[PDB]
Write a protein that binds this ligand. Structure first.
Ligand SMILES: Nc1nc(NCCc2ccc(O)cc2)nc2nc(-c3ccco3)nn12
Ligand SMILES: CCCCCCCCCCCCCCCCCC(=O)O
Ligand SMILES: CCCCCCCCCCCCCCCCCC(=O)O
Ligand SMILES: CCCCCCCCCCCCCCCCCC(=O)O
Ligand SMILES: CCCCCCCCCCCCCCCCCC(=O)O
Ligand SMILES: CCCCCCCCCCCCCCCCCC(=O)O
Length: 448
């Protein structure tokens, strides 16, 4: 066996899987409506880039490993085309990170901000930039436009001979790869840290009622901000903003910080507690509860009012008798539960257990999917960094012994493997993909 016949076989095998695997990803999104969200718009674009790697980039890699004589610019295309595909991938991974960001920290305006129309727009633009960036050497930044054994008008097509290293290190690596990766690292880290935030009465209603940092109109058209904090019933945004500046103690222009929204909420809680203590029915029960169960009672007052909660004569009684399970069953038979089952179910769980479980679960499911996608970026980095780092060595230490050929082509094979791993990850960690794959393979591929 030859030392190259292996290189060629291995890379042809990689190409077949790259194509088959990523065709399957696109196939699923087309068939399944539950995979036709905006997030998978970028997954498909990413899958497209990986298919193109198996079809063109890899054959180009093999062709160029011969060092054959070719025209300058024609040689640059074969060598640089893969850079186009790589850049596109970067943009796709970055857009996924951001998408998951404003979907987990700012859920209230995700669908009004992230739309299919805009996604397609951003994708189209990113493909243009990818060509502009990947084919920059073709635009003039090269080493042939000014070489023997090939005759004039031609040069031996060796990567390091035609593609400037200062381009590969400064522009390609540092600016176009390194920066996005670190940016994607910061975004995911912030997503994760948010799911591990410390829970309390503020984070409790932030989930049940939502958080707004810009003045908005409530269900009945009243100016409101923060967590359900009504400013005024006057039909004037101007007047609403003036009320806000009075409460905050500064010129807000209709926008406050998270912290400031919390101070308003704290005040709202204090008032509710005072109202509860003036009520002869609620006081005995409130006083007998622990801190967490009190928050669940305050939660109900924020929704139904103090007179409303005081109507639960029997459920309240059980609560003071610490008959948590009985109270739960009874509260479940209410018209309140029938109206808002999700919110009520969480509040009731809080009465049952006396923990923040119901609210911690919401955050841990609202992030589990982002872990799957984050793994995608980690593997990309792992598959591409080695090659980038070797370039830096060659570049920064000119008179050192160059990396041996075996190591060089090993880093190249590795980077190509990155176009195979994604489909496997979707199968293992994402349920709706796995189920669609099984359906496709069994029905359309085996045909039964
Ligand atoms: N440095 C480099 N070389 C090659 N092919 C040339 C391999 C080689 C290695 C040593 C030698 O003496 C002659 C040729 N492809 C390459 N692709 C990349 C690359 C892709 C993405 C980032 O860097 N870098 N890179
Ligand atoms: C012929 C058109 C595409 C058919 C794809 C056939 C499957 C080929 C296997 C190579 C890709 C594997 C990707 C992940 C495997 C899916 C696992 C599974 O759901 O059982
Ligand atoms: C010169 C001929 C060789 C072709 C090489 C490039 C081939 C790679 C193109 C792959 C593009 C995949 C398109 C996926 C789009 C599907 C979108 C959808 O299902 O909504
Ligand atoms: C799985 C394979 C799918 C088919 C992909 C098409 C492959 C394209 C091959 C690229 C060839 C590089 C150009 C060769 C230059 C020829 C020079 C000459 O003929 O004088
Ligand atoms: C999706 C379309 C991507 C664009 C690729 C189109 C397919 C091109 C097939 C092979 C291109 C050969 C490049 C020119 C040949 C370079 C070497 C030479 O000058 O002989
Ligand atoms: C939105 C369409 C962009 C078309 C310009 C792309 C030019 C070259 C693209 C090569 C592969 C592109 C595949 C993009 C598929 C997009 C998937 C989607 O938008 O749902």
């Amino acid at each position: 066996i030859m030392g190259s016949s292996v290189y060629i076989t291995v890379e042809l095998a990689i190409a077949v899987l790259a194509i088959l695997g990523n065709v399957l990803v696109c196939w699923a999104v087309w068939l399944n409506s539950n995979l036709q969200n905006v997030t998978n718009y970028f997954v498909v674009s990413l899958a497209a880039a990986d298919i193109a790697v198996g079809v063109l980039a890899i054959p180009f890699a093999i062709t160029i490993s011969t060092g054959f004589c070719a025209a300058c610019h024609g040689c640059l295309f074969i060598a640089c085309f893969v850079l186009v595909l790589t850049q596109s991938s970067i943009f796709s991974l970055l857009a996924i990170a951001i998408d998951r960001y404003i979907a987990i920290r700012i859920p209230l305006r995700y669908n009004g901000l992230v739309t299919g129309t805009r996604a397609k727009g951003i994708i189209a633009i990113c493909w243009v930039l990818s060509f502009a960036i990947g084919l920059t050497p073709m635009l003039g930044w090269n080493n042939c436009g000014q070489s023997q054994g090939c005759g004039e008008g031609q040069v031996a097509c060796l990567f390091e001979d035609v593609v400037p290293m200062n381009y590969m290190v400064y522009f390609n690596f540092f600016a176009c790869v390194l920066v996005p990766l670190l940016l994607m690292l910061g975004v995911y880290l912030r997503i994760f840290l948010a799911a591990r935030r410390q829970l309390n009465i503020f984070e409790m209603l932030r989930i049940d009622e939502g958080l707004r940092l810009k003045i908005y109109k409530d269900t009945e058209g009243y100016y409101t901000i923060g967590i359900g904090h009504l400013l005024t019933k006057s039909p004037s945004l101007n007047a609403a903003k003036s009320e806000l500046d009075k409460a905050i103690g500064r010129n807000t222009n209709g926008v406050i910080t998270k912290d400031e929204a919390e101070k308003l909420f704290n005040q709202d809680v204090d008032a509710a507690v005072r109202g509860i203590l003036r009520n002869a029915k609620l006081k005995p029960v409130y006083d007998s509860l622990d801190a967490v169960r009190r928050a669940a009672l305050i939660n109900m007052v924020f929704q139904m009012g103090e007179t409303g909660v005081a109507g639960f004569t029997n459920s309240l009684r059980m609560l003071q008798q610490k008959r948590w399970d009985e109270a739960a069953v009874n509260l479940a038979k209410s018209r309140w539960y029938n109206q808002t089952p999700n919110r009520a179910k969480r509040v009731i769980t809080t009465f049952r257990t006396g923990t923040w479980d119901a609210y911690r679960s919401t955050l841990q499911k609202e992030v589990h999917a982002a872990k799957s996608l984050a793994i995608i970026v980690g593997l990309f980095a792992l598959c591409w960094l080695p090659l980038h780092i070797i370039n830096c060595f060659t570049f920064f230490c000119p008179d050192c012994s160059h990396a041996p050929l075996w190591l060089m082509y090993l880093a190249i094979v590795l980077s190509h493997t990155n176009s195979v791993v994604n489909p496997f990850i979707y199968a293992y960690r994402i349920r709706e993909f796995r189920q669609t794959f099984r359906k496709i393979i069994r029905s359309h591929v085996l045909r039964q």
